[PDB]
């Protein structure tokens, strides 16, 4: 629920509308929360929906090419992307550099992504890092290929974006108006072999060059 | 205190003030310049 | 471009104080949080400087 | 000192500042929302 | 009208320090005075107040 | 003189306008002389245009809802201010007794 | 909080990865002295990891993780020490922008 005073929106709304700015910032925060929930939700999150047979541990802590190949062996039918913390990306780059195997890069959404075996590695700050340990996630997406898909509710009342709506609720005797901003989301895995998790990824190990 | 909404001081940072031209207090109607004929 | 030589950068203060509710399962009838977005009261202002001869 | 012309501080009272929309430091590219298909 | 609720009244300070030269007779070749018009650095600002019920 | 359907006493050509809002305490009141206008650097009033729910310029009415007692509420707001462009546009005469009477013998 | 030191003095790939971790949201370019470019090239050669190049403004720029490295003689070099700068530009992405005054006389 977003609270806006009527005086503030009445007086200081030139050249920027105050209610519009408040709604925009609230919607950005809500979308960041949605991105966090699609990974960390205890019911439909990616880390919770992975089966024990699709989860493996690192051979020696650090993320190495061998570990990524082992992770690929589990989702070998058309992988889409990797997902990890930026610190995990740096650790994987260090491990690749130590072995003299520089991976190429690709351009997507105005960014540069490191690819391993042709599969891009995408960073995300919502992947938890605890005690210097993080996770790697390999995912196949699509309904036609029986992958992982997102769910949303269309045709909402007050819809701004597909799955998000804003509704005016009234004024509360203090000349303060309120708005209700709601979003509905879920995540479905069509087949078990469309998702895998690599666990125990240390991100604080460094090599020596004498 | 715990405010329930955005305050005026923070909200006024996004708004333009209405500025007047400088006001001169020594300006007089100068009736003599209008009462005389000029050759 | 700067229309009159002064550029003001407005910023959000305390982004972690925006409270959101997300349900894990079996939604209830509990009251929702009420919040707002706060701004910095003394934003940094840039004024153009001259290089001349 | 005796200034020869109008200063910047007094002259800026007649000028409008260029104001940006508030900048949120927690905004991320949110690649996961773009990589997934939505049903 | 006030576009955003704030009204600033700019005023000239020290109007007696503007120097002018007027000749009474038989003009000479003396240097002219040099001056400018000064403004108040902290003008009074008006903000609208509410009457409501 | 005739103005707004009324008759105003004028002194030196300047009308005298009555108003019950001028305070009267202990039998004393005040006289106010005012010059108005932006071109003449006088006294002006300020208002906010383009309000949501505007009825008259500077006044708006908004519906707020119903309060579980089948009673509806409305918010009526007005914003105003007064600015003096130059100091010599306003003067006040104080200590005006209004309870003195003369005799005609 | 956005400034770090080199692990062992010379600019190594690990140092550039650590710098990238701070500006991980869409970096634009690196900026350093040409001597820094030569030192980074030497350190890359020692580990056998030759970086690719890109063409921009009629020049050839070494790229690291897809981010070009741009030389500039205005970056100070004192006592054989220089600096590396990573920058994101743009108003839509809340980056670094330059300001100028339009409509000047003459």
Automatic annotation (TrEMBL), chain A:
Coiled coil: none annotated. Residues 1-204 form the Type 2A encapsulin shell protein SrpI-like domain. This is Major membrane protein I. The chain holds residues 98 to 307 of 307 of the full protein.
């Amino acid at each position: 629920l977003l609270d806006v005073h009527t005086r503030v929106s009445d007086l200081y709304s030139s050249p920027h509308d105050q209610v519009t700015q408040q709604l925009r910032l609230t919607i950005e925060t809500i979308k960041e929360r949605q991105e966090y929930e699609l990974v960390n939700n205890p019911e439909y999150g990616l880390l919770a929906q992975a089966t024990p047979e699709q989860t493996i541990q690192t051979l020696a802590g650090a993320p190495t090419p061998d570990d990524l190949d082992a992770l690929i062996t589990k989702v070998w039918k058309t992988p889409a992307f990797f997902l990890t913390h930026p610190l995990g990306v740096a650790a994987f780059g260090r491990e690749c550099t130590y072995r003299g195997v520089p991976p190429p890069t690709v351009s997507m959404y105005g960014a540069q992504f490191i690819t391993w075996r042709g599969i891009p590695i995408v960073p995300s700050d919502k992947v938890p890092v605890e005690d210097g340990t993080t996770k790697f996630v390999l995912v196949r997406t699509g309904e036609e290929r029986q992958g992982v898909v997102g769910l949303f509710q269309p045709g909402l009342v007050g819809e701004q974006a597909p799955g998000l709506s804003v509704r005016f609720t009234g004024i509360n005797r203090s000349a303060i108006a309120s708005y209700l901003v709601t979003l509905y989301t879920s995540l479905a895995v069509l087949t078990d072999d469309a998702l895998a998790v690599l666990d125990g990824v240390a991100v604080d190990q460094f090599h020596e060059y004498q | 205190n715990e405010s329930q909404a955005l305050g005026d001081l923070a909200a006024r940072q996004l708004a333009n003030a209405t500025k007047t031209v400088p006001q001169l207090s020594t300006i007089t109607p100068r009736f003599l310049l209008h009462l005389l004929s000029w050759v | 471009p700067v229309e009159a030589g002064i550029y003001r950068v407005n910023r959000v203060v305390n982004p972690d104080r925006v409270a959101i509710h997300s349900e894990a399962g079996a939604g209830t009838e509990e009251p929702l949080p009420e919040t707002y977005v706060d701004y910095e009261t003394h934003p940094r202002e840039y004024t153009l400087r001259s290089i001349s001869t």
